């Protein structure tokens, strides 16, 4: 079986909370009035979906989510356009990616069309939480947990699928660009060949916290995740990594690591490669990039810009990488940053409906 949006039971909150200051926002700390919940059991399958007041979950302390990280999540955004139509951005890709993660977690499958419809009804009810700001958005957090009251390492026979909404302001409180410093220690690895690094499964992030703490203790805002003997640069924290440079053949190139199973195939990532290919003003390469490739390129003044991209931060310029004690300067902000800005402009124009696109859907 599968749950249907048609069967939605709606319990509106009787008291509505004060909306947050659209600038004065700590990320994922403010929650809207309503949540979606759908119960699943092996015995009866999917219960009817519920839109109800944000509340605590009552979970058996043996729930597999708390013991064996039988859990996954998504992140997508709703944007209030210049025309004051609320839009989702490639939401079908987030549904697709969430379904694949469920199968790989052995959580029960669901109808992707129906979840997306339930998400729209939730956003619609809470639409005034979609900020009145051209640099803020509503974060949508679909979450899926095993609630199997059993310590047996097994496919769960009980689960909960729920969706939270959280209004998130501009990544940096100037709303322009505040370049990130990166901590690069090969001692830690986010993901590996034959792992789950290409899925948003909770286990990928729990092992990262110690590295992020270590980043903050050496001044940096994010981890540069290194992989393999040659120290490949994979991901800028929770974001895909782009390098804009003169390559080894002396060519202008936008370069990003390939989707080889250790990389999260970000929606932003694919969009930026599409844009880059469409413009055809420089070479676009899904290729391996090492710290040696980077420092060799830096000594030749061949590096122009480095930036992260994810739902978190559409474009996040990198200014510095801490590596083997020394601080390595990336001249991103000294070069405009021309490409980073052109990309942020185009994605933002699309997200906020300043131009039409296949990538956006107007809210039901």
Ligand X SMILES: COc1cc(C#N)c(Oc2ccccc2C)cc1-n1c(=O)cc(C(F)(F)F)[nH]c1=O
Ligand Y SMILES: *Cc1c(COP(=O)(O)O)cnc(C)c1O
- Return residues touching a copy of itself (CB under 8 A): 26-29, 31, 35, 54-62, 65-71, 73, 75, 103-106, 139, 141, 143, 145, 149-155, 162, 164, 166, 186-189, 191-196, 201-210, 212-213, 237-238
Binding status of residue 7 toward Mg ion by CB under 5 A: no
Pick one of 48, 154, 193, 324: the residue that binds ligand X (CB under 6 A).
Answer: 154
Nearer to ligand Y, 156 or 202 (CB): 202
Interatomic CA distance for residues 153 and 62, integer angstroms? 11
Nearer to a copy of itself, 183 or 359 (CB): 183
DSSP 149: B
Number of residues in contact with ligand X, rule: CB under 6 A?
A: 20
Binding status of residue 111 toward Mg ion by CB under 5 A: yes
- In the chain, residues preceding a discontinuity (C to N beyond 2.5 A) are none
Pick one of 147, 268, 319, 332: the residue that binds ligand Y (CB under 6 A).
Answer: 268
DSSP 10: E
Instruction: From 137, 144, 171, 169, select the one nearest 159 (Cα to Cα).
Output: 144
Question: Measured on CA atoms in the order 108, 112, 114, 117, is the torsion positive or negative?
Answer: positive
CB atoms within 10 A of CB 26: 9
Interatomic CA distance for residues 113 and 116, integer angstroms? 5
Pick one of 4, 23, 28, 81: the residue that binds ligand X (CB under 6 A).
Answer: 28
Nearer to ligand X, 2 or 150 (CB): 150
Least distance from ligand X to the Cβ atom of residue 54, Å: 17
DSSP 239: E
**Tokens found for residue 224:** 């540069």
The Cα-based distances of 312 to 6, 31, 76, 141, 240 in angstroms read: 32, 16, 9, 12, 11
Nearer to a copy of itself, 9 or 103 (CB): 103
- Contact set for ligand Y, span 208-247 (CB under 6 A): 235, 238-240
Residue 267 interacting partner from Mg ion, ligand X, ligand Y, none (CB closer than 5 to 8 Å by kind):
ligand Y
Least distance from Mg ion to the Cβ atom of residue 3, Å: 10
- Contact set for ligand X, span 232-291 (CB under 6 A): 237-238
Interatomic CA distance for residues 207 and 188, integer angstroms? 9
Least distance from Mg ion to the Cβ atom of residue 7, Å: 13
Return contacts of 57-63, CB within 8 angstroms, 24+ apart.
57/160, 57/162, 59/145, 59/147, 60/147, 60/149, 62/148, 62/149, 62/150, 62/151, 63/145, 63/146, 63/147, 63/148, 63/149
- Contact set for ligand X, span 312-351 (CB under 6 A): 312-313
Classify residue 103 as left (phi > 0), alpha (psi -120 to 50) or beta.
Answer: alpha
Nearer to ligand X, 188 or 279 (CB): 188
Residue 17 interacting partner from Mg ion, ligand Y, ligand X, none (CB closer than 5 to 8 Å by kind):
none
Residue nearest to ligand Y (CB): 266
Binding status of residue 152 toward ligand X by CB under 6 A: yes
The residues that touch ligand X, with contacts defined as CB under 6 A, are: 27-28, 75, 139, 151-154, 168, 171, 205, 212, 221-222, 237-238, 310-313
The residues that touch ligand Y, with contacts defined as CB under 6 A, are: 75, 200, 235, 238-240, 264, 266-269, 310-311
């Amino acid at each position: 079986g599968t749950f249907k949006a048609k069967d939605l039971i709606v319990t509106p909150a009787t008291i509505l909370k004060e909306k947050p200051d659209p600038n004065n926002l700590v990320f994922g700390t403010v929650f809207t009035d309503h949540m979606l919940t759908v119960e699943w059991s092996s015995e009866f399958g999917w219960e009817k979906p519920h839109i109800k007041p944000l509340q605590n979950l009552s979970l058996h302390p043996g729930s597999s989510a708390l013991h064996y990280a039988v859990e996954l999540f998504e992140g997508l955004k709703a944007f209030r356009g210049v025309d004051n139509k609320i839009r989702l951005f490639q939401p079908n890709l987030n549904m697709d990616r969430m379904y694949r993660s469920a199968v790989r977690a052995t959580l029960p499958v669901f109808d992707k069309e129906e979840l997306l419809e339930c998400i729209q009804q939730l956003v619609k009810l809470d639409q005034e939480w979609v900020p009145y700001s051209t640099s803020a958005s509503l974060y949508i957090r679909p979450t899926f947990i095993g609630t199997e009251p059993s310590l047996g390492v097994k496919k769960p026979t009980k689960a909960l699928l729920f969706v939270l909404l959280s209004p998130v302001g501009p990544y940096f409180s100037s709303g322009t660009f505040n370049p990130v410093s990166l901590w690069a220690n090969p001692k830690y690895v986010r993901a590996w060949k034959g792992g789950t690094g290409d899925c948003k499964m909770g286990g990928n992030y729990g092992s990262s916290l110690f590295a992020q703490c270590e980043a903050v203790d050496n001044g940096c805002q994010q981890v540069l995740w290194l992989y393999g003997e040659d120290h490949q640069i994979t991901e800028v924290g929770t974001m895909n990594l782009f390098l804009y440079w003169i390559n080894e053949d002396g060519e202008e190139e936008l370069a990003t690591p390939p989707l080889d199973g250790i990389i999260l195939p970000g929606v932003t990532r694919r969009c930026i490669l599409d844009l880059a290919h469409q413009w055809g003003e420089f070479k676009v390469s899904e290729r391996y990039l090492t710290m040696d490739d980077l420092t060799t390129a830096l000594e030749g003044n061949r590096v122009r810009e480095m930036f992260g991209s994810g739902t978190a931060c559409v474009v996040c310029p990198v200014s510095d990488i801490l590596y083997k004690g020394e601080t390595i300067h990336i001249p991103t902000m000294e070069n405009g940053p021309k490409l980073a800005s052109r990309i942020l402009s185009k994605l933002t124009d699309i997200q906020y409906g300043r131009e039409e696109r296949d990538w956006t859907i107007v809210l039901s």
